[PDB]
Amino acid sequence: SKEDEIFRIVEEKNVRFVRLQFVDVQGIPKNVAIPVGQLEKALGPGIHFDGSSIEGFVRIEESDMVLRPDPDTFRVLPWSGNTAEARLICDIELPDGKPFMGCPRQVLKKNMEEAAKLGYVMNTGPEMEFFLFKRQDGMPTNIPQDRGGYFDLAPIDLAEEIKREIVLVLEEMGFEVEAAHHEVAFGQHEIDFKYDNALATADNVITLKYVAKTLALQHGLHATFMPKPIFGVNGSGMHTNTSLFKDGKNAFYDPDAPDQISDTLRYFVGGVLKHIRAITAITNPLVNSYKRLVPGYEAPVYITWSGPNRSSLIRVPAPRGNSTRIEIRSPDPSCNPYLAFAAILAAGLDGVKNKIEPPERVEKNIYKLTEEEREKLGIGMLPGTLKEAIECFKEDELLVSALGEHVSQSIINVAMADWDSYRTQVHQWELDRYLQTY
Amino acid sequence: SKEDEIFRIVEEKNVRFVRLQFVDVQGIPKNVAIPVGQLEKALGPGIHFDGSSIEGFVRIEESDMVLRPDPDTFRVLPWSGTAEARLICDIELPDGKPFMGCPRQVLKKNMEEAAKLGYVMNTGPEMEFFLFKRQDGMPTNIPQDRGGYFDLAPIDLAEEIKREIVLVLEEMGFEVEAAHHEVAFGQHEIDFKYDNALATADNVITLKYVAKTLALQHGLHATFMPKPIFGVNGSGMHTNTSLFKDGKNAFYDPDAPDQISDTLRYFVGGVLKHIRAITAITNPLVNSYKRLVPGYEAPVYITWSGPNRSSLIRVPAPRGNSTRIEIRSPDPSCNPYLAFAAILAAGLDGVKNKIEPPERVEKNIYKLTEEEREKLGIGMLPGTLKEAIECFKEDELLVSALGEHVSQSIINVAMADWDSYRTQVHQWELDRYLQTY
Amino acid sequence: SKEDEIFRIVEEKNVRFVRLQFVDVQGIPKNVAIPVGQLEKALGPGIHFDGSSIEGFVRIEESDMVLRPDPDTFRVLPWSGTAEARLICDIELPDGKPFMGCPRQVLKKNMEEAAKLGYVMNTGPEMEFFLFKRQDGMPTNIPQDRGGYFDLAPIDLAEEIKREIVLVLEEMGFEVEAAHHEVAFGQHEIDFKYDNALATADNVITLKYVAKTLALQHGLHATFMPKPIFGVNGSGMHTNTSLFKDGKNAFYDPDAPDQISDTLRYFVGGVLKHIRAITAITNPLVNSYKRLVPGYEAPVYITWSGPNRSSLIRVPAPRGNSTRIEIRSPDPSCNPYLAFAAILAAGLDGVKNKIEPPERVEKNIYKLTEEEREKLGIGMLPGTLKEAIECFKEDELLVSALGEHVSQSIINVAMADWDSYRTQVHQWELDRYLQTY
Ligand SMILES: [Mg+2]
Ligand SMILES: [Mg+2]
Ligand SMILES: [Mg+2]
């Protein structure tokens, strides 16, 4: 069985500790370290723990929970020197064996199972943008490690060595990396890995953030997936490439169709656009996410879909065949990948199941359009603030049902907690603008 | 004539310079210094100047304007040298036509419309302000002391400067009523007697001028910013208002319940009707809405009541020629000329059309639940500056009273501040997300 | 095939990453790092990427491009780790059509046109560059030493790093000819053997990459900026050029005077004809014209001569298969692909139409008077970057050879730099005028 190979690897690689990973609703990694002597117990009945101290999980009066590891996610952490360490991505179950409704990974699993009913397997291949910042007195800052730009090369790109270190580590963990390059903003970078099913890709996203932040710390740096850490430079975003597969073939490809795109592609897009306002509360979960998604500026805030036009929200790149896909450009890397993929799959399937026609394509540069011109074309915009998107998310009956009322309420609780604090704040901008004059 | 006494004062006090004061749409004082030899020219044909560089005035292609001083506003600045004086001015065009973008002219227009019905509006504002330290010649938001409400020295470290301000004000003709330390650190309040809206607005601009000037002489910075420090009280310009007709207080009616005339209730009904749009004038800054925060001890909930200090409109105890309402939503950063005009037009709309106000609310509105407020139908003010500007655009009455020119200037400056504020990355976001994400 | 040997090298040298190199219109190197597992995909269908964020490439609405590597350009970077390799790429569109904005494709096109007549252009540039100190991790313009021409240690403090660069270059297949300290402080020059224009341009981009990378490893900053220090020499990319037809040097003719063929003179006549417009390509920066200053020891005067090192075009002594002309006006900051293409098209226009060059000038052109230069009809290059861009707009031949797309990109970036440069208030102006005016 799978558990036999796990213990075979432990004896050979001399693994002495296993980390039992999972995420809260926010997507922040959590783990318990156990000696390898408890591994038999962890893979059997599971390791109990107190969930009342995890964000958006359970209450104090019913706090006992259980970690149910996923055997396939077993990897050895390469940065271990005598004394190795391994990790297991876990699901959360209740003491009675019932799956915990609030576990984000279980949510994606549920939505993937529903998609399997209809014969669809959603593949996702995200484009992770991130920043590398300096540390000052052991504390992270928002100072770029280099002042380079798009596709730049050393000596303008000062992070070639650490990016080479990150990619190598990932490959050692079974990743198939496709490309790595310096992004537009100062000290911004992008690592792209090969598409996979939603669950494996989500596990990979959480893993990549762990590896990136870890090695950056070893270099005296700080990696951050925050959407808009610096004002005046490009924000980091998570362009999510998506495609549906059915009967082993790309369900989005249809050679006998215009532009060689099937009606399934169009209906999937129609559903995603139909719910995009509510989805943004998931894919752009921070107050800071809307300082990148700002109306009226060079950002994918205008609800449109087009061909290879990189100013719309949903792009349809040139490749066809088994590479036919759609690129959703609104999400940013701070989102919970399990919940983001779940919300996109739910909306897209709602479009396929119900034959939701998408709007006309907009092959023009939407960024250079006038508000009057946008009104004539009926182009709407995404929520402007976090509170705006949460209100939109509350009303989407399909999304709340697809994510579960437990998860949905936790997302609303943490968001409105951040907002109620942010709206009361007095920022430096207000002093710099009014203090001398008034 | 008035001009003759002005020159009598000049020779006695040996005034050598005269400042020609006015304000842009934002309420910021503007002035030109002319030698006393040019005073005869100013009080006659006026002094020409360039209006293209004043906020919300005229374009570059038709920029020549004329300052027309109001002789009643002549005062000698008590900080001499080489004495100096000042004149508040109305802005006119070269052809003698009044410039309908001038805020002071706007108030004059709405008051003339009130005079058509025989009404004269009186106002008396409670001016809250902060006294902050200067660091390297630049102003800061550090309180000059760490005292509180009605505190006495040594806790109150600004007694000597408040004594100087009140003295200067009284020398300038003010009838000061009281001064005291306010709730927040280094916060204070000076109250002066009421007067007609035009007089009171001139007093408001003068008080800020006197307070800010003397604060500078003491190495401090007086600011009328609404919410300069997070976590402490904010500055609020409570505005007491009353209408007078045929010499008597139109808000008083001894034969009525609570001795409140129907003109009072109708006036309140109209103010509450337009209060969502008035807030763009009375609370014009982005920072204004860090004091007018929903769900906190702040006059955010649209209600009117008696002496209950938690409602938006308060009707204090005094009756007779002292009957008044107190509007507590404004803050000191508003343009007093525009704020009084917007309140006057809205209140007269209530009287003109007999707009019944909602039921009073004498309970503690701050301690009500969101569920309780919905049962009583209590609404809220705009939450942000954009929200209020959007409500101000749709108010056809207010835009017509203030004038399309002034209204457009207000919208332009507000959306300018907003488009800059909404794109900023603030420290709060880095403190909240940088370490974990 | 070539692809088979690439994978043979990968296994032996244990290469794990491959960089896909190219350049924007400005000549700045750009690359994408792909794991060696993706190399099979790159050499087949190619690697797609976004071209909207590359300078002077494509718009946002049609941004999907494809990198198509040239297998001949595969080299292993001698600074290993975890070995790394690189491939120079041509940019194509998703439909397989070549992107006519790609500078490397432009040179290819003009070379194909030269092949139509049986000509192959050869180039060998003399690369002058500076070695500067780093302060707080940022580059500076402080010379690493204070030495001069052909100076030896300890005066020359960059012997160890030049030894490293040449070693790396030779390991990358370069045939290095000589290296030495140049005139200015911390200035140096490395010369490598000539080759065809495409090969040599790849060598130029590689040399700057190797020089700048190793300089960083030693804590320095190598810069190919034309005039980074006022009062010392500037960096110049003398460009030796020759044409080959039927395997022999087309510029050599033993039966002719000075053993110079008519093809040589006609080629020179065409280059001089368009040299005012070529300068926008060969000297593309504002800073380029602080080295090309009229009235100083700099190749500014449009002339051609023999081995006289003061003319714009020099015909060195070697004949036979070494007959060449040396164009001394360019500087290292130019895009070598675009510079070689502009020179080729202009020279072929001279050969095609038999354009007679002006009389040679074998005297010291720098020591001539403005009066003397007018008698001989000697012209001058553009004085500023705007002057050269205006001359480049009117050159219908050059714009057609480089292509309307690349030409427009060049004009856009140049006028962008100029509109920013012309509005600046420089320190020189404050030093000259602030105290007295
Ligand atoms: Mg990107
Ligand atoms: Mg008070
Ligand atoms: Mg030389």
Listing DSSP states for C195-263 in one string gives: EEHHHHHHHHHHHHHHHHHHHHHTTEEEE--S--STTS----EEEEEEEEETTEETTB-TTSGGGB-HH
CA angle at residue C183 from C177 to C187, to 5 degrees? 70
Q: CA separation (Å) from C80 to C15, C22, C218, C398?
A: 9, 21, 16, 42
Experimental method: X-ray
Q: Is the C-alpha dihedral spanning B252, B256, B261, B264 positive or negative?
A: positive
Encode burial over B314-339: b for 16+ CB neighbours within 10 A, e otherwise: bbeeebeeebbbbbbbbbbbbbbbbb
Distance (Å, whole) CA B421 – CA B384: 11
The candidate with the shortest Cα–Cα distance to B333, out of A429, A426, A434, is A434
Tell me which of A130, A430, A436, A437 to substitute to probe the interface with B (most B C-beta atoms closer than 10 Å).
A430
E strands, A36-120, in order: 47-50, 64-69, 75-76, 84-93
Q: Closest approach of chain A CAs to the CA of C220, in angstroms?
A: 10
Distance (Å, whole) CA C147 – CA C161: 15
Annotated catalytic sites of B, by residue? Answer: 50, 126, 128, 182, 189, 238, 309, 326, 328
Burial of B98 from C-beta contacts in 10 A (0-12 / 13-18 / 19+): middle
A190 CA to centre of ligand 1 in angstroms: 7
Nearest neighbour of A365 by CB, restricted to C33, C38, C60: C60
Binding-site positions of C for Mg(2+): 126, 128, 182, 189, 238, 297, 326
The candidate with the shortest Cα–Cα distance to A223, out of B428, B425, C34, B434, is B434
Amino acid at C244: F
Nearest neighbour of A150 by CB, restricted to C47, C54, C84: C54
**Length of chain C in terms of residues written:** 437
Q: Dihedral angle at the C-alpha atoms of B309, B312, B318, B319, nearest 10 degrees?
A: -150
| Exposure of A28 in the CB half-sphere (CA atoms within 13 A) | 13
Q: Is B240 annotated as a binding residue?
A: yes
The candidate with the shortest Cα–Cα distance to A239, out of A328, A171, A300, is A328
Q: Is A61 annotated as a binding residue?
A: no
Burial of A34 from C-beta contacts in 10 A (0-12 / 13-18 / 19+): middle
Q: What is the CA radius of gyration of chain C?
A: 22
Q: Is B109 annotated as a binding residue?
A: no
The residue to which tokens 């920013």 are assigned? C420
Q: Taking a C-beta distance cutoff of 8 angstroms, is the pair B203, B195 a contact?
A: yes
Token readout for B242 is 């009353």
Token readout for B196 is 């007609």
Residue A167 is given by DSSP the state: H
Interchain contact A130–B (C-beta under 8 A):
no
Q: CA separation (Å) from A96 to A21, B163, C371?
A: 21, 75, 103
Strands C313-314, C304-305: parallel, antiparallel or unpaired by DSSP? parallel
Q: Taking a C-beta distance cutoff of 8 angstroms, is the pair C132, C141 a contact?
A: yes
Peptide bond preceding C316 in cis form (omega within 30 of 0): no
Q: Taking a C-beta distance cutoff of 8 angstroms, is the pair C317, C252 a contact?
A: no
E strands, A104-204, in order: 121-136, 139-144, 177-182, 188-193, 196-197
User: CA B24: distance to chain centroid?
Assistant: 13
A304 contacts: CB under 8 Å, gap ≥ 6: A312, A313, A314, A359, A361, A362, A366, A379
Cβ of A181 within 8 Å of Cβ of C21? The answer is no
B residues 51..80 contacting A (CB < 8 A): none
The residue to which tokens 């598409």 are assigned? A195
Encode burial over B138-150: b for 16+ CB neighbours within 10 A, e otherwise: ebbbebbbebbee
Coarse DSSP helix, strand, coil percentages of chain B, rounded to the nearest 5 percent:
40, 25, 35
Interchain contact A406–B (C-beta under 8 A):
no
B231 CA to centre of ligand 2 in angstroms: 17
A332 CA to centre of ligand 1 in angstroms: 11
A140 contacts: CB under 8 Å, gap ≥ 6: A133, A222, A224, B434, B435
Active site residue A190: yes
Q: Taking a C-beta distance cutoff of 8 angstroms, is the pair A394, A411 a contact?
A: no
Which chain C positions have a beta carbon within 8 Å of A310's beta carbon?
50, 52, 60-61, 63
Which chain A positions have a beta carbon within 8 Å of B417's beta carbon?
433
Cβ of B436 within 8 Å of Cβ of A296? The answer is no
Cβ of A423 within 8 Å of Cβ of B141? The answer is no
Angle between helices A276-283 and A263-274 (to 10 degrees): 70
Interchain contact A349–B (C-beta under 8 A):
no
DSSP states along C407-419 = HHHHHHHHHHHHH
The residue to which tokens 């368009």 are assigned? C274
Cβ of A438 within 8 Å of Cβ of B285? The answer is yes
The residue to which tokens 């597969």 are assigned? A245
Q: Dihedral angle at the C-alpha atoms of B181, B184, B187, B189, nearest 10 degrees?
A: -50
H or E stretch at A168: helix A160-172
A207 contacts: CB under 8 Å, gap ≥ 6: A75, A170, A173, A175
* 3-class secondary-structure state, position A36: helix
Distance (Å, whole) CA A124 – CA A242: 5
Annotated catalytic sites of C, by residue? Answer: 50, 126, 128, 182, 189, 238, 309, 326, 328
Q: Which ligand is nearest to the CA of B234?
A: 2
DSSP states along B284-325 = -SGGGGGTS-TTSSSS-EE-EESS-TTSSEE--S--GGG--E
B183 CA to centre of ligand 2 in angstroms: 8
Binding-site positions of C for L-glutamate: 233-234, 291, 297, 309, 328
Cβ of A291 within 8 Å of Cβ of B28? The answer is no
Nearest-by-CA chain A residue for C53: A150
Cβ of B225 within 8 Å of Cβ of A288? The answer is no
Interchain contact A432–B (C-beta under 8 A):
no
Active site residue A129: yes
Q: Is B192 annotated as a binding residue?
A: yes
Interchain contact B369–A (C-beta under 8 A):
no
Q: CA separation (Å) from A67 to A42, A199, B53, C352?
A: 8, 18, 68, 81
Q: Is B194 annotated as a binding residue?
A: yes
Q: What are phi and psi of B328, to 5 degrees?
A: -105, 0
C155 contacts: CB under 8 Å, gap ≥ 6: C145, C146, C147, C148, C181
Token readout for B342 is 């917007």
| Exposure of B268 in the CB half-sphere (CA atoms within 13 A) | 27
Distance (Å, whole) CA B233 – CA A5: 65
